[PDB]
């Protein structure tokens, strides 16, 4: 024991995955007006597993209007804020792992 893996757990990997998820969600918003662009999704369970032990398409709710674009900006906005809250919560979890680890080694 007493290893950075055992000390931080999956919190050291969740930060990177949610940063990737924000990148994928952000490019969906930017490419919303680009015709023929298919909205791209990320599987959190699969990506987290890959990072721990060293992208899909989003089905549209309604047919596109003729540009071939399957980006629903209402869904992209909603998923972006949820990821941001979870990303902030992940940093709080990971950050306190170091602070508690520093507290033990220094005794204060």
């Amino acid at each position: 024991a007493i290893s950075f893996d055992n000390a931080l757990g999956i919190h050291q990997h969740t930060v990177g995955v949610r940063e990737r998820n924000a990148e994928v969600i952000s490019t969906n918003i930017a490419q919303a007006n680009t015709p023929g662009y298919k909205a791209r999704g990320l599987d959190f369970a699969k990506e987290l597993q890959a990072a721990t032990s060293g992208k899909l398409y989003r089905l549209p709710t309604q047919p596109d209007t003729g540009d071939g674009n399957t980006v629903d900006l209402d869904l992209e906005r909603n998923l972006f804020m949820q990821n941001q809250i979870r990303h902030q919560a992940s940093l709080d979890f990971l950050g306190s792992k170091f602070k508690n680890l520093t507290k033990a080694i220094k005794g204060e």
Binding site: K38, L56, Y57, P60, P63, T65
Partner: peptide, 19 residues
């Protein structure tokens, strides 16, 4: 609702029969 095969582009035909 995520698939590994891209969704198909919608078709707006004026006759359907011709398609």
């Amino acid at each position: 609702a995520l698939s590994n095969q891209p969704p198909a582009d919608a078709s707006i035909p004026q006759d359907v029969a011709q398609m």
